[PDB]
Structures are given as C-alpha cells and as structure tokens.
Symmetry: D4
Subunit: 183 residues, 8 copies
C-alpha cells in the first residue's frame, strides 16, 4: 500500500532510516548503500515496499522504483524472504545482482550469507529471464496481467500499434482492450 | 478504511497510480480507463476500496463512489476476488458491466479473462438485481440495522407524515426514537 | 490505534461519514444521531474505535470518548460484534443504553434488532457492574491496572497522598510506583 | 512500522496519551513517568513501537529510542508480552531495569506484578549480555553479523577496512567491508 | 468423532486412564470418581467426547452419555473450556452439578477452583433451562427445531402425525412429520 | 479419510447413530430415514463422509455411496455446509432431492429450513447438470480429473475404446494414459 | 490422544519403526536405542506421544512412560521441538539426560546437535526443578492439579487420611474432593 | 502417521480404493497402475502417505515403500501438491518418472497436466539428485540428527573398525555413545 515515504530524516542507522511524514515517523529498512546517501535533519524520499504479515508490517526503501521492484521480484522466489532479499542487495548492488542473475554467477550469490549452492541455483533458474533478458512489450504484459493469452494479447497490440503508430503505451492498451472487449 | 486518496500523482503506470498525500505515496490499483484521466505532477483524488488480507493491504481506486461500490459488489460473489473484479471492470466499463449483468449477457462477461460460462452465469444470477426519494433510503437504512421491512416502512410513513419535507437523515433518527418506543 | 479523525467532511451517508484527514479520506461508521450533527464541506472531529480483524480494518466514530468507550465495552460481551453494538447505540443513546443496562430493562434491550430474550440478560449480567456508578480512587485502579493487587495499591497510594500534601493524580501514581518498586 | 508520532496532545491519561498528527489522533500507551513530561494542548513527540497482531494494532511510546529498544527486547523473552513489558517498565525506569537485569536482581523483578521467581530468572538468563550499556569496529561487525555473516569472517573484513582507512565511519567501514565480502 | 472407547485398561492414573482398543492405547481424561470404577487389566468402556483443536486432539471419558453430554454443554459457555469443565465435574458429580446450576447455587460453583463469582453467574444464566432433567412430542419437535424448523411450524406437524398415528415412535413420528413438512 | 464404518450399533438417536468398530465407537450423523433402518445391538455398515475443520472432526453416514456422494456435492455449493446439507436430505430423500435439482423446483428447496429463494437458485444453477443430466464418459472424467483437457481426453478414449472394445473402464483408462503419456 | 501402539513390526528403520495395529500400520519415530530392541515380524508395544499440528500428525514411541513423559517435558521448553527433543534423547538416554539437566552439565548438553551455549542453559534452568527428585503427596498434587491451592488441598487430604485409617490414593482423592466441595 | 492399510478391498474405483480394516473403511487415493493390481472382496495392503491439512486428512497409497517415498519427495517441491504429485505419477510410473527427472527431460514431464516448461525445470533442478552398504546409511542417520558429516564419518569408521560385521543399527547407536562422549 505504501509505495513511498518523503520527509525529514530523523535518524540514520546502519540497517535503516526514520523518515517523518506529517508528524509520523516511519522506520524503513535499507542497505548501507542506500543509507550512505542519507543525512539526518534533511528531507528525503525513498521508494518503499510495504510487506504485511500476520504479526508485522514493514517498509523496505530504495533509491528508485527499478530497485524496489527488484526487491519484490527476489521475494517471489521460494525460500527467499524480506531479510534474505535485503542481504542479497546489501552484498550486491542492484546492477551487479542483476548481472549475476544473468551470468548465472552461482559463485557470487553464494557469498550472500544464507544462499547455498542450491538456493542460488533456484534463484538463477527462477529469474534470469525476468530481470532483463518500448510500447509493444509493455502493452502485452499489461494484457497478460489482466488475464489475456499471450499469443492473442500480442495479436491485438500489433493491430493497434500498426493501425495507429503515434500511440502511447497507455492509449495502445485502451485500444487493444476495446478490440478484445469485442465491441 | 481508507475511502479515498488526494494528492500529487507521482507516477501513472499501466495498471496503477501512485498518489502522494502528506509525503506518503500510496499505490492505488486502477483500470486503464481510470488511469487515463490522470497526469503526473498533478493533484488528483481517487475513490478507493481498501482490501485487508493476512499478508496484504491493497488499495483499488476509481473516479466515483458509484464505481467503487460496484467493485465491492463483485467481490461479494463466490470465486471473484480483487484481481478479477478489476479485470472485469477493465474489459467492461462500470455502465456496460452493469448492463451485461442486469441483461444477463453470458457472452459479454465471458470475454473477461477468468470468467467462464458457469462463472458468468453465477455473477448474472447473484448480481442481476444487485445493480442499480426518501422513503426507500430511510427504510433501507433501518433494515440495515436489522429491523423488518414491514415494521421499518410502518414507522417511516408515520414520520414522513409528521412533517413532510424532512431530511432523509432526520426522518431516519426520528423513526428510530419511534422504534426504541415502548 | 486510531483514536480520532479530524478533517473535511467529504460525504455524509446514513450509516457512515467520510472525513478527509491530510488528503486521506477515512470511512467512519456512525449512528444516525451522530451523523446528524455533521454537514459536508465542514471541518469535523470524531472519537473513533479502530477494529482490526484478519480481513478487515474498520473505524467507528462517536461524539465523545464517553460513547466510544461504551462501544468498546459492548464488545466485551460474548456474542456481540460491531454491527450489533452500533445497532444497539443507534436504537438507544449512550446515556439511555446505560440505563437499560443498569436497570436490567430487558424489554427495552430486546427492542434492538439482533438482541433477543437471553441475549439481553446475558448483556445485563455482564455490564451492570461496569456501566455508570477524586485523586485516590484512580491512582489505585491504575496500580490495579498494572497488575498490583489492591491491599498494596492502596497502602502505597495512601502513603504518598499523606506524604505529598496533595497534588497531581499523575505524580501520585508514579510516586506510589517508586515505593512499590523498592 | 510507525516509529514515532508527533503532534498536539489531545488527552493525557494515566496509562496512555493521544497525539494528533495531521488530523489523525493516535493513541499511544506509556508509563506514568513518560506521561508525566506531557502536557495537553502541547506539541509533543514520542518514540513508538508498533505491535501488530491478528486482531490488534497498538502503539507503545517512550522518551527515546534507547528505551523503546529496551521494550522490544523485553518482548523477545518467551512468555513476556506488551502488557507485562509495560508493567515492568512502569515499576522500574529503563536504567533501573537494565541494571536489575544485568545484576540478576531476581528480587527486584519479582516485585513487578505478573512476574514470578521463574520468569525473573528466564528474563535474566535471556537478557543480561544483551543490553545496550551492560566504537566503530563492534557496530560494523554487529551489522555484518546482522546481515547473515559469521563473527569471524566479519571481524576479518572490518579490521582490514579500518587498518586501510585509518579510522573513519561505521557507515563507510560497513560499505567497504561488504565490498570485500562480496569477494 | 470418537464417542467411546472399549478395551483393556493399561493404566489407571489419578486424572486419566489408558484403554487399549485393538492395539491402540487411547488416553482418556476423567474424574477421580469415573476413574474409581476402573481396574487395570480389566476390559472397560467409557463414553468419550473428542475435542480437536489446532495443536491438540483429546478424549474426555465418562460413565454414560448423559454425563458426557453435560460436559459438552459446559463447554458451550464462553470462557469455559475442557479443563475447567473437568474440574467442575471433579468437585461436583453430574447430578450435583445440574442441581446446583438449576438452583442458581452460585455459592457451590464458586467453590470449584478457577470459577469466580461472575463465571458462576454466566454459567447459571447460560445453563439452567438447558439441562436434560431440570415423551415423544417434545423430542420430535426438538429434532425438527434442530434441523432448522421453527418451534411453531414444528409442533403443528408433530401434533398432526401423533393424532393420526394414535401414539407410536419418536422415530416414525419424526419421519412422518418431515414428510408433511416437505409439503 | 474414513469412507465407511461397520460394527455394532450401540445407540440409535434421532439425528445420529453410534457404531463400534474394534472397540472404538464412532458417532455418525444421519437422517431419520437412514436411522429408521438401524437397530441397537445389531451390526451395521454406513458409507460415511469425514469432514475435518480446525476445531472439529465429523462423520456423516448414508445407506449407499451414491447418496454419500450427493452429500459431498451439496457441500461444493457456496454457503452450503454440513448441517444444511444434512437438512436438505432429511427433508428430501436423495431421489427426490436430485429430482428437485433437475426440475429446478425452487419451491421445494425453499421448504428446507435455511434455503432462501436465492440460495435455492444458486444450488439449482450450480448442480442441475452435475447430478444426472458406461465405459466412455467415466474414463474421460478420470482423465479430466488428472488434469487433462476434455476434447483431447475424449480423443484418447475413443481411440482406445475403438481399437479395443472389450475394454473395462479401468483398462481403458490405463490405455488412454499410455497414449497421452506419449510413449 | 494415542498413548501406545502394539502390533506386528512391519519395518525397522534407523529413525523410526512401523507397527501394524489391527491392519493399520503406524509410523512411530524413535531413537536408535529404542529401535534396537525391535525385530521385524514380531509383536511389539511402544509408549507414544502424539504430536498434533496444523499440517502434521506424528507419533513418537518410547520403551516406557517414564521416557515418553520426559519427551513431552523437553517440549515444554521454549525453542525445543520434536526433532531436537528426539535428537537429545538419541544422544543421551532418559536417565542420563536427566542427570545432565539436574547437574546443569551444559558441556554435555551442547554435545547434542542443535543445542548450543545458551540453548542448554535455557533448558537447564527450565527443567532442573522438574526432572528427578507415598499416598499423601500425589493426592495433593492431584488437587493442586484440579486448580486447588495447597493450604486447602493439604487440609482436606490430611482430614481424610486421618479419617479413613489409610487406603487407596484414589478414594483419598475423591474423598478430599467431597469435603472440598461442601 | 498412517503408514499403511491392510484389509478387505470394499471398492476399487477409477482414482482410489476403499480398504476395510477393523470395520473402518479408509479411502486410499492411488494411480490407475496401482489400482489395477486390486480386486474387490479380496485382502490387500497399500503403503500410504497421510497428508494432514487444516480442512483435510487424505491418504495416498502405493505398492511399495519406495514409491510412497518418491511421492513425498515430489511434495517437497515448491508449487507441487498432492493432486499433481499423483497425476505426475499416473502419467509416469515411479521408475520412469525417476529417470525423466534424473535425466532432466523437460519434454516428458511437460506431458503431465499441470507441469509447464518452467515447473518441469524446477522439479528437474530440485530433484535431479534427490532420486535414488552400511557406512553411508549410518552417517546419514547421524547427519539426520544434526551431526556434521565429517564428524559423522569420523565416528562411523571408528566403529565399523571396532568389530566389522555389525548391524547398521548397532553401528549407529555405537557411534552415538561415542558422540555423547567427552
């Protein structure tokens, strides 16, 4: 629910920061890297990921949305929870971590405390082609997200994009839907 | 609990928006149609439906209360959760979705990914009527408190007959004192 | 956790109001009576009781803590949830309802939809000795509140009230605590 | 998630207060002592600890994070919950409480209502060598341990960084140690 | 599900026994009194009440179903669980317990450990007009009510059947009343 | 798990029976109709349906498996639990209940206490073509049950049945699988 | 609920045995020591502890109640589950383990995989006063067991033991109960 | 808990069997291959895997322990539950399924309804090795108690060197006393 928190940095710890928004101070966990860029008494905005469990409600912040998204993705792998996800990133910056996950670098992953030889392999297997392996593609992802079949979702997207090129990613989606909604 | 969010649109994505209110940016999920009327770096407000679950708290936003209510009404149907409720709405605007249901159009609904012939019929069955001036609202509020329609009506008529031009709320509390009677 | 909501009234329905506090509009379920005193586009505050459940997070507003408290109390009774509780309060104001309870007027309680025969007796039995009837009394209940007995929560308090001529109920409490600790 | 609330004090009670931040009045539980320093109609800030359970979401306020942390720590003992924790802190101020715990003062703890002879002993066993009182190397190792690294390997990298970078910051030292650890 | 166990008594204890039915030794909890009548190495039968919880599956034995039913009934009172129920029945024999309850003997109940003044009162309020002691028409209506029919409609059909079938069996009367009710 | 219980009928009540198997007495809920056929002190076998919930474990018995299956089917409808299911059957024998559910007889269903106008409609809608509206069909049901697509499941079944007619329902299934397992 | 399983041994592995009781073969997890005394195709009995959890229902066998009991006891400690408990018993027989606990021999406890430094101290502290050191003592614990204090569970018992010359611990208990009830 | 059921086959259906043991008929789910070797009105025994869940307790039976274990091993894979585990086995006999996995044959597995290219690869990845004489079993039992392989081996070699022809169990307990050493 909480996608971001912007406010006065009240405290910069070694594994988190406290940002005050409208008098409310939110604790947001982060990596040294993300923290290093923060200074007490200054304003700051972090892109967060709110993770609610039965006995907890936690925020994890990052510099950008690309990174925050990467975190959420790490979470989708079996046996990889919030903490381990953060550790992976604390040990390997987003850019590297991604790289490793493409180069199937199992040696590198292992270094992250908590990731065994197998664990690393499951991570590499689960997301090598889900990190980085543009009008068109985005629109079909949107349609597949709404539950449409791929080789049909892309059929609408080509018709739309071809019938109208100047189309933005959003308008393109609206169009595809109108054709899929079968007028 | 959160019925709405008003703030600066920090980001307009393909399936949701981020609105900042008091330095807190809330992710509000929405349909492409709703998503269209929005612009980044602008002030905006979306009527929302906050769904609380064990491992999640998600917001779903719409242009008006009316639409946000139809959203919740879809959830009231067995088998239909938020994702599908949203998809149904993305494929059919509120106005149309309402007719498809009221009109019992199994074919149209089926065009929504996830809704099969059987599932479409259920929605048509359970919602057919469920899709849609002081007397009715007052008794409704009353029935909403467990009172029996008949008894609810029989106290509302009495009140509206007391004084006629009475706020719907005023007629309601007035009818309550009569029901806490003796 | 949320004790009160104060902001612009965005909508006033028959069983709830929406108060926008800092851009976020909270839905607050209230009684027609309470809802009566509220007009849209106006600033308003409401003492609330936040009910947290696995699949829900709901607010309940009232004019004062006096009523918000009774509400919470109604919920102390086995078999009584928020809907029934609000219903009860909608049929009888906090003041009166207390009377019905203290006077065990089961005939009036049953007037509330959802509360019948034994349901009322169950309530009358569970709430009488805690509905509606000084620096010393509190300070002791506060100690009894932290777990302290009474025989001892009274001696420490008497010790301090005779010690410090007579001042704040606060310092008397934290003073009785200091003794109770050594 | 909520680490602190700041706003107007709407009501000071004997076991809780109401601080109103941006229209929202949050109820935060505290000890007579913590409540003492507060005055209604005044703007005040309190370091809180948000405990979320299945049918409850509560705030517990304190004067500073140090005290707040003590509270969280009390909760780490089996059988010790929010209520008992507060009671403990209401009878013994934080300093006193840490003192007692480090000095196995079972007699003192037993005085707290609800805490018996055994409980006092478990607490003393649990908390004793774990109290922020009863400095760049240790912290950095602490964080490295926290991220999943073993004590040995952690010291090894922290020492290196410090020897190279004369003496600097826990932050930089941490970030630099993680770099080495990344192999 | 398990309503009774019958087999060799492997061990009579002070608060439970072990009856071995077909190789499986079931532990069933009971009162000193119920345990009295039992003798090790003897074949014995006990009417049980199986309480299944999330992390527990237990048996509670009694001399006859009547008593077993009383136990189940005690459990229908908010705040009253298996343990308290047993204790209640250990101090007061079933007859005595029903007596007390019907006679609002709050003094007697309060004697049971764990049951206070209030508890005794709730119990008396709850149980009192609901005790199998403190006959074909009533039962059949009882069953018809149990199946979801309202008292009025239920009597109406039961009377009919009985008037037609002079006087017969609760069974047949029930089956015949359900037929009419089926319209 | 428990599909049936055969033993000495220890007690015949108005809404259940107690059958003892190897010294263990199981309480099995049933309709008057099913009970009427039972007599105390006699042996008896009932086809049961064990329904386990977090705080309970119950058995529901019937004359045959066709009926027991009908019960399980009623359970698959939304808002229809064990009790209501039993009541439907207590009020309408299997044969009739089925009939009603085909003739969309909403009037009849309503009579069952607990089934409103809408409730009945959902039941009729959900299972009119799942009660009764043979080598071939059974084999495809088996394959669809294992997760196979219908219009492909039946394609294998025809090949098998045609290539070999004398086939039993079971052997026919084994065959289809071998062809679907793609040798 | 299942206190013991007696039947034909169908299989004897290294960490468990399968006893077929009346056609049903129950898997019973045991220690190599216990498993030692068992030979396939032979009749065997085993005192068990049935552990019921949401997604599991497991049995644990032992030679006697003495050990099955200690097992249950090990589980009374925070942080100790069935695996670790069995492991402990597999490394130290019930007798010895009791010694290690009573003598707080933390160096020996840590020999058990999964139990380290403080883990052992935690156990030593939680179990000593309940590990390994008459008609009157029991009867009183039995009353203390039903909730009775002690001051009173001792007087009623002394009253009856002096009343009835001296007989069954049973009748003494149900006799003390009869007094404690009037 | 229930490792096996032996009794009269009361019914042999298309996807399960009913075996009566002590007048209790248990529904044992099984594959068509296993289902074949069974005849009604005959005595039979199936090695089972009892899966306990909040709202269910289901039995799955097979011809041998070996096969029943492979069944549980499939469950250990993320995303694979009992239904699919059974389907996989119905489409591929234990022997073949083992090779398909060991051989990492994504194509074959994909023939199983429910197992896609991605899901097949996961199973191949997580089980590839997981599918398959006294030294190894003894250290394994030891490692099963948390002991470190190296230390486990270093105590087993010592024992097997004590006396050579020693039961695998005897070597195990013997190695344990050595590990509870000093």
């Amino acid at each position: 629910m909480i996608a971001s928190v912007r406010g006065e940095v009240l405290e910069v710890a070694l594994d988190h920061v406290v940002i005050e928004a409208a008098g409310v101070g939110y604790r947001v966990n982060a990596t040294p890297a993300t923290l290093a860029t923060l200074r007490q008494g200054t304003e700051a905005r972090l892109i967060t990921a709110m993770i609610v469990r039965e006995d907890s409600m936690t925020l994890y912040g990052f510099p950008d949305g690309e990174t925050r998204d990467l975190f959420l993705t790490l979470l989708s792998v079996s046996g990889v929870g919030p903490r381990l996800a953060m550790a992976a990133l604390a040990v390997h910056d987003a850019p590297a971590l991604r790289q490793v996950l493409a180069d199937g670098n199992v040696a590198a992953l292992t270094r992250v405390p908590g990731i065994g030889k197998r664990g690393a392999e499951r991570m590499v297997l689960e997301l090598r082609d889900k990190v980085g392996v543009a009008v068109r593609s985005p629109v079909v992802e949107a349609l597949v997200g709404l539950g449409f079949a791929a080789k049909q979702a892309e059929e609408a997207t080509d018709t739309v994009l071809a019938a109208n090129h100047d189309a933005t990613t959003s308008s393109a989606l609206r169009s595809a839907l109108s054709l899929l909604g079968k007028a």
